Structure formats: structure tokens, C-alpha cells
């Protein structure tokens, strides 16, 4: 997270950390709890090549990484069939937990938006995670969960932004209809925030607008962060997640 504070303890109960085996169960990607047994995350964290489930664990909302690890196992991974790279699109994936989670005041699911929501510019949206804090800098070793409030851009304005200073012809669409844009030179997600939720407070309710996907570096001029547009994939999600 570029910019922003440490998060208040109560504030983001659906945030998940994904761990990979090694000398220790290292954090590598974020996610969100959308149902007591399902986690929503970015496909490029787990694909396109298949992974052994021996190597993966899920951690719920701790405040500081690694201090209180109670690693949950994963029963299955599902990746959108259209995925191959993040710039092509369909960067979305599902994890099914072996054991369901006791929902609690401290651990609660995020709400998915109705398919009619567009999230026009000006909305109040936040992104959260344990990713890097400046363009090359690891989060320092207390490892707090950070948060930042980002601006939203309309897609066609975002596509124009990406064409500045590039050789790509202006006929060629860079930012696609299954994507969403947010952030600016002061406020962005970064490495290791991938797969984390972007949420917006619509009508008093927190809805997940998107998933941290890709960008041309962190906080760079005329390069907003690109997010997977969750409403675009609702029919694919509800084929598996028991609504």
C-alpha cells in the first residue's frame, strides 16, 4: 500500500492472507472471505499453471502478520477458464476452505455488489493489504495491515491515460471492460497487495468493487492501478458459491 495508515483493529473483517510453504509460511497474496467457505482472489496468484495444495494455507484477519498464525487448509482451487495473463483479462479465482469458518464480530464476509452497480467516479473506496509500501520497499517487520482511500476513474479516461508516453496506437484498447481503474501518484496498491479487495461504501453498506490485479509500477504518473471488475463475473462466481 502506497500512502495510507495502519488499519484500526475492528475495521476490515473479511481480509485474508495467502501463505506459501518455505523456511516459513510466507505471505504472498491477499484475498477476501465472501462466504463462510470461499475466498475470492486474483488468478495470477495461483495460476495459470496448477499448484499443489500441500504448499498453500489461508490466514484470516490478524492485525500483524506472523504473530498469531492459525493456518487454515484449502480443499480446492478454481480459476476462471479464460485466464492466462493479467493484461488479457479474467484475472479472478476462488479458494474453497476445507473447514468452514465461524463467523464472528471479528471475522465476517464482505458483500458482493448487485450486477447493476457501476461505481461511478467520486465514490468512497478503500484498498487494504500487506504489500510493499514504496516502489521497491518491503513492509517493515512489525507487518501491520495498511489501508488507503483511492479515487475512481471512468474506464475510457483510464485508457487514454495509459496511451500517454507509449508507442501503442490509440485504436488498441489497453483497459478492458472487465477491468476497473483507481488510484493516483499518491495512493495505490503495490506488490504483494495483489488479489486484495477494493471496497466501496454504497448506501451505508460495504460492497467489494474489485480485485487488485496489475499496473505499470506503483504510483507512477499516468498509470493508475487496474482492478478486476467483480460485477463482470457474478454469474461465474455464483456457479460455485452457494448464494
Amino acid at each position, epitope marked *: 500500500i502506497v500512502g495510507g495508515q495502519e488499519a484500526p483493529r475492528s475495521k476490515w473483517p473479511w481480509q485474508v492472507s495467502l501463505r506459501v*510453504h518455505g523456511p516459513y*509460511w510466507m505471505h504472498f497474496c491477499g484475498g477476501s472471505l465472501i462466504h463462510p467457505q470461499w475466498v475470492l482472489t486474483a488468478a495470477h496468484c495461483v495460476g495459470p499453471d496448477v499448484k499443489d*495444495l500441500a504448499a498453500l*494455507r489461508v490466514q484470516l484477519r490478524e492485525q500483524h502478520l506472523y504473530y498469531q498464525d492459525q*493456518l487454515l*487448509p484449502v480443499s480446492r482451487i478454481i480459476v476462471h477458464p479464460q485466464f492466462y495473463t493479467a493484461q488479457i483479462g479474467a484475472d479472478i479465482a476462488l479458494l474453497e476452505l476445507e*473447514e468452514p469458518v465461524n463467523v464472528s464480530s471479528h471475522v465476517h464476509t464482505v458483500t458482493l455488489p448487485p450486477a447493476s452497480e457501476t461505481f461511478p467516479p467520486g465514490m468512497p473506496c478503500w484498498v487494504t493489504g500487506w504489500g510493499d509500501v514504496d516502489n521497491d520497499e518491503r513492509l517493515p517487520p512489525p507487518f501491520p495491515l495498511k489501508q488507503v482511500k483511492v479515487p475512481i476513474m471512468e474506464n475510457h479516461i483510464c485508457d487514454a491515460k495509459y496511451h500517454l508516453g507509449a508507442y501503442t496506437g490509440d485504436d488498441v484498447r489497453i483497459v478492458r471492460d472487465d477491468m476497473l481503474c483507481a488510484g493516483n501518484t499518491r495512493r495505490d496498491s503495490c506488490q504483494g497487495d495483489s488479489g486484495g479487495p477494493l471496497v466501496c461504501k454504497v448506501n451505508g453498506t460495504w460492497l467489494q468493487a474489485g480485485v487488485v490485479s496489475w499496473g505499470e509500477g506503483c504510483a507512477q504518473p499516468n498509470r493508475p492501478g487496474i482492478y478486476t471488475r467483480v460485477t463482470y463475473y457474478l454469474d461465474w462466481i455464483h456457479h460455485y458459491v452457494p448464494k
Partner: antibody
Amino acid sequence: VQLVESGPGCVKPSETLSLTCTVSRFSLIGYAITWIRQPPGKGLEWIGGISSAATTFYSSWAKSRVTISVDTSKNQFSLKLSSVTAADTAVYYCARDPRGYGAALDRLDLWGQGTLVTVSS
Amino acid sequence: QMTQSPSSLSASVGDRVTITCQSIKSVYNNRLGWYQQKPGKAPKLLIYETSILTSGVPSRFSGSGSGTDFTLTISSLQCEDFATYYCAGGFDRSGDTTFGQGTKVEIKR
């Protein structure tokens, strides 16, 4: 990297049997352990186990009498079986599931050596 | 709950053998494996997730199965392949999982 069981070898009827498994290297933070029993000449039967999330699962008959527990301060897993009878004489094993599932038998990759327990007067 | 067959067999060195395991239902998610128990020591995992060969196992061993019926097959027997074999599988999460009764393989010589 290996497990070791421990136990009394001999117990009389109506005591409570205790067993203990210890992680010889690293810490099995993230991993799971199941307990397997083998009466002489018979095949294997599953007692129970504990998941990476610390959830315990017990076989049909084991719920009446078994408790499984973990203590990171000793890097150990422990089994207790109440009210033993002569028919409990078997080899006992602890084994690890690398996925961390508390109730699975298809991928027990790493095993202890096992210890006999004989129930006799 | 499962049955495994044959309960016993005898076969020469250089022969080929196959063993079956069956069930009333299907395995929740390719969760079936095969174990080799040498006499006097702990069982060893050989095959997991229906057909993945465990590392370091000589690729003499093979297996596959249709969710309800499963097979284990040798390339050809050696003397040290002597063991009892068990299938094991799981039919849900948290519940119905079991070993089979086991098959004991003995060598003509």
C-alpha cells in the same frame, strides 16, 4: 525429518493409555497428525486426528473415549484413550498429512515407527 | 466403506498383477491412495490422488480409477516388492474415510 511415538508398552486394563508424538525437526506449524492403530494380523484402523487449524476429528467408535491434543511448547502431539480393554492391544502410529487436513487418509506422507501397546493383567 | 480384492494372491517374479478396491459411493475429489507395508515397519505412501507417483518410487507401480472402482498395477514383480497393500480413501470432508482390508502379495519361486 521424522516422528517418534512414546508410550508405556505395557498397561493393565482400566487405566487410561497415553501416547505422545514429537516433531524431530522444524515445527509442524501448518501441518496435521492422525493416529492409526493396527491389531495383530488385522489391517489398519483410523483413530482420529487434528487439522492444521486445530480442529479434531474422531472415528465412529473413538468419540466415546479419545482425546487428541497439541502443545507447541513441547513440539508434541498427544493421544489419550480411556478405559482400555485387552482388545486394544495394537501397534499405534502417528502420521502427517502435508495438506493439513484433519480427516484424510489418502496422503499420509510421513510416519512414525510405531509402538506396541499390550493390554494385560 | 470399501472392499479390496483379491484378499490374497501368489505370482512369480517377472509376472504382472493388479489389485482392485471398490465402494458404495465415490471419492470426494480424487482422494484415493495406495500404501506399501513392508513386514515389521510403517506403511509407505506409494500413489496419491488416484495416480500421482510418490517421488523416489520406481515407476514400476501404476494406478487409475473411475471414482467408484480403482486399480493398482505393477510393471513386473521383484522380490522386495513383497508387502501387504492397502487402499485408502475419503468420501467427504470430516467424515467417512477408511482403509481397505488389505491384500498380501506372495512370490512363487
